Design an enzyme around this catalytic site. Structure first.
Site, PDB file in Angstrom:
ATOM      1  N   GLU A 293       0.838  -1.193   0.000  1.00  0.00           N
ATOM      2  CA  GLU A 293       0.000   0.000   0.000  1.00  0.00           C
ATOM      3  C   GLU A 293       0.877   1.249   0.000  1.00  0.00           C
ATOM      4  O   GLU A 293       1.991   1.249   0.532  1.00  0.00           O
ATOM      5  CB  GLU A 293      -0.929   0.005   1.219  1.00  0.00           C
ATOM      6  CG  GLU A 293      -1.863   1.215   1.314  1.00  0.00           C
ATOM      7  CD  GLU A 293      -2.734   1.375   0.077  1.00  0.00           C
ATOM      8  OE1 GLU A 293      -3.712   0.609  -0.071  1.00  0.00           O
ATOM      9  OE2 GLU A 293      -2.434   2.276  -0.745  1.00  0.00           O
TER      10      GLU A 293
ATOM     11  N   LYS B 178     -15.611  -7.879   2.321  1.00  0.00           N
ATOM     12  CA  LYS B 178     -14.270  -7.837   1.734  1.00  0.00           C
ATOM     13  C   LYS B 178     -13.848  -9.199   1.207  1.00  0.00           C
ATOM     14  O   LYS B 178     -13.274  -9.299   0.117  1.00  0.00           O
ATOM     15  CB  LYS B 178     -13.238  -7.320   2.744  1.00  0.00           C
ATOM     16  CG  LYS B 178     -11.785  -7.543   2.300  1.00  0.00           C
ATOM     17  CD  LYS B 178     -10.782  -6.619   3.004  1.00  0.00           C
ATOM     18  CE  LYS B 178     -10.631  -5.276   2.281  1.00  0.00           C
ATOM     19  NZ  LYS B 178     -10.372  -4.140   3.217  1.00  0.00           N
TER      20      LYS B 178
ATOM     21  N   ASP C  52      -2.225  -5.080   0.946  1.00  0.00           N
ATOM     22  CA  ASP C  52      -1.588  -3.970   1.643  1.00  0.00           C
ATOM     23  C   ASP C  52      -0.182  -4.287   2.126  1.00  0.00           C
ATOM     24  O   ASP C  52       0.694  -3.414   2.064  1.00  0.00           O
ATOM     25  CB  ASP C  52      -2.434  -3.542   2.843  1.00  0.00           C
ATOM     26  CG  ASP C  52      -3.783  -2.987   2.434  1.00  0.00           C
ATOM     27  OD1 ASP C  52      -3.847  -2.255   1.429  1.00  0.00           O
ATOM     28  OD2 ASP C  52      -4.787  -3.296   3.116  1.00  0.00           O
TER      29      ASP C  52
HETATM   30  O1  LIG Z   1      -6.101  -1.009  -1.587  1.00  0.00           O
HETATM   31  C1  LIG Z   1      -7.260  -0.647  -1.782  1.00  0.00           C
HETATM   32  N1  LIG Z   1      -7.705  -0.165  -2.941  1.00  0.00           N
HETATM   33  C2  LIG Z   1      -6.862   0.016  -4.112  1.00  0.00           C
HETATM   34  C3  LIG Z   1      -6.753   1.467  -4.509  1.00  0.00           C
HETATM   35  O2  LIG Z   1      -8.070   1.970  -4.751  1.00  0.00           O
HETATM   36  C4  LIG Z   1      -8.256   3.328  -4.774  1.00  0.00           C
HETATM   37  C5  LIG Z   1      -9.502   3.855  -5.076  1.00  0.00           C
HETATM   38  C6  LIG Z   1      -9.675   5.230  -5.091  1.00  0.00           C
HETATM   39  C7  LIG Z   1      -8.625   6.072  -4.809  1.00  0.00           C
HETATM   40  C8  LIG Z   1      -7.391   5.546  -4.510  1.00  0.00           C
HETATM   41  C9  LIG Z   1      -7.194   4.174  -4.489  1.00  0.00           C
HETATM   42  C10 LIG Z   1      -8.302  -0.740  -0.698  1.00  0.00           C
HETATM   43  N2  LIG Z   1      -9.531  -0.305  -1.012  1.00  0.00           N
HETATM   44  C11 LIG Z   1     -10.504  -0.363  -0.099  1.00  0.00           C
HETATM   45  C12 LIG Z   1     -11.881   0.124  -0.506  1.00  0.00           C
HETATM   46  C13 LIG Z   1     -12.782  -1.000  -1.035  1.00  0.00           C
HETATM   47  C14 LIG Z   1     -12.202  -1.221  -2.425  1.00  0.00           C
HETATM   48  C15 LIG Z   1     -12.015   0.198  -2.933  1.00  0.00           C
HETATM   49  N3  LIG Z   1     -11.870   0.986  -1.700  1.00  0.00           N
HETATM   50  C16 LIG Z   1     -11.835   2.328  -1.651  1.00  0.00           C
HETATM   51  O3  LIG Z   1     -11.673   2.973  -2.682  1.00  0.00           O
HETATM   52  C17 LIG Z   1     -12.037   2.995  -0.314  1.00  0.00           C
HETATM   53  C18 LIG Z   1     -10.959   4.009   0.024  1.00  0.00           C
HETATM   54  C19 LIG Z   1      -9.560   3.454  -0.083  1.00  0.00           C
HETATM   55  C20 LIG Z   1      -8.807   3.574  -1.248  1.00  0.00           C
HETATM   56  C21 LIG Z   1      -7.526   3.067  -1.334  1.00  0.00           C
HETATM   57  C22 LIG Z   1      -6.965   2.427  -0.254  1.00  0.00           C
HETATM   58  C23 LIG Z   1      -7.678   2.290   0.911  1.00  0.00           C
HETATM   59  C24 LIG Z   1      -8.962   2.802   0.990  1.00  0.00           C
HETATM   60 CL1  LIG Z   1      -9.835   2.611   2.491  1.00  0.00          CL
HETATM   61  N4  LIG Z   1     -10.254  -0.880   1.149  1.00  0.00           N
HETATM   62  C25 LIG Z   1      -8.999  -1.334   1.506  1.00  0.00           C
HETATM   63  O4  LIG Z   1      -8.808  -1.788   2.645  1.00  0.00           O
HETATM   64  C26 LIG Z   1      -8.007  -1.251   0.531  1.00  0.00           C
HETATM   65  O5  LIG Z   1      -6.794  -1.701   0.881  1.00  0.00           O
HETATM   66 MN   LIG Z   2      -6.700  -2.410   2.793  1.00  0.00          MN
HETATM   67 MN   LIG Z   3      -4.800  -1.544  -0.268  1.00  0.00          MN
END
Ligand SMILES: O=C(NCCOc1ccccc1)c1nc([C@@H]2CCCN2C(=O)CCc2ccccc2Cl)[nH]c(=O)c1O
Ligand SMILES: [Mn+2]
Ligand SMILES: [Mn+2]
Length: 179
Positions: free
Chosen positions: A64, A118, A92
């Site tokens: 991440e 998830k 991550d």
């Molecule tokens: O890595 C993750 N997503 C890949 C990048 O996606 C992006 C999407 C948009 C912008 C920037 C990045 C990931 N996503 C999620 C959750 C549910 C799936 C989509 N999501 C989100 O967009 C929520 C916000 C978020 C984005 C990125 C990282 C953490 C969060 Cl909280 N929850 C995780 O725990 C996780 O690790």
């Molecule tokens: Mn995550």
């Molecule tokens: Mn992630």
């Protein structure tokens, strides 16, 4: 110009803020408008970093916070050297001790719900999942919490501190209802 954007900027450290806004850029979202998501990504990022510090010196590889190409690049290097299943979605962290990927969740909702949602999405049998809530609950795959209790407790403390800071500024309800 939201109250939330300014709160995020003085609550998280600049390195975290930089990585968050870059992550939103790469996916075409605006921290100036999508402020609650801005706060959520910073929170998710800080938790991942505290988590990776929780272990031995070089226990975790952090995936991440990288740009997408390099993040996938590291995943295949891990896979192609540890003989581990290549996940469908970006994890991550990677745990060199336990030889598994980890996706960390942070939720305002009930941890059971978020976990169930998830697991279906990731659709990776092998990826370990570790969920934290803003209320102090955690749920991990196979009841295996990876870290010792004290490392997880400081994560939970920080999460509750963020919740109080937000609520003291009246951003909590909007933040809670946004998930
Ligand atoms: O890595 C993750 N997503 C890949 C990048 O996606 C992006 C999407 C948009 C912008 C920037 C990045 C990931 N996503 C999620 C959750 C549910 C799936 C989509 N999501 C989100 O967009 C929520 C916000 C978020 C984005 C990125 C990282 C953490 C969060 Cl909280 N929850 C995780 O725990 C996780 O690790
Ligand atoms: Mn995550
Ligand atoms: Mn992630």
């Amino acid at each position: 110009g939201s109250h939330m954007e300014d709160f995020v900027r003085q609550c998280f450290n600049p390195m975290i803020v930089e990585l968050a806004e870059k992550a939103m850029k790469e996916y075409g979202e605006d921290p100036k408008i999508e402020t609650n998501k801005f706060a959520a990504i910073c929170t998710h990022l800080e938790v991942c970093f505290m988590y990776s510090d929780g272990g031995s010196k070089h226990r975790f590889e952090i995936i991440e916070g990288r740009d997408r190409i390099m993040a996938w690049t590291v995943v295949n290097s891990i896979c192609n050297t540890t003989g581990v299943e290549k996940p469908k979605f970006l994890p991550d962290l990677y745990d060199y001790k336990e030889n598994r990927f980890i996706d960390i969740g942070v939720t305002r909702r009930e941890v059971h719900i978020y976990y169930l949602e998830k697991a279906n999405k990731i659709k990776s049998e092998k990826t370990h999942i570790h969920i934290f809530s803003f209320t102090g609950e955690e749920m991990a795959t196979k009841a295996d919490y990876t870290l010792d209790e004290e490392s997880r407790a400081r994560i939970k403390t920080r999460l509750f501190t963020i919740r109080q800071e937000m609520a003291s500024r009246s951003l909590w309800d909007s933040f809670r209802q946004s998930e």
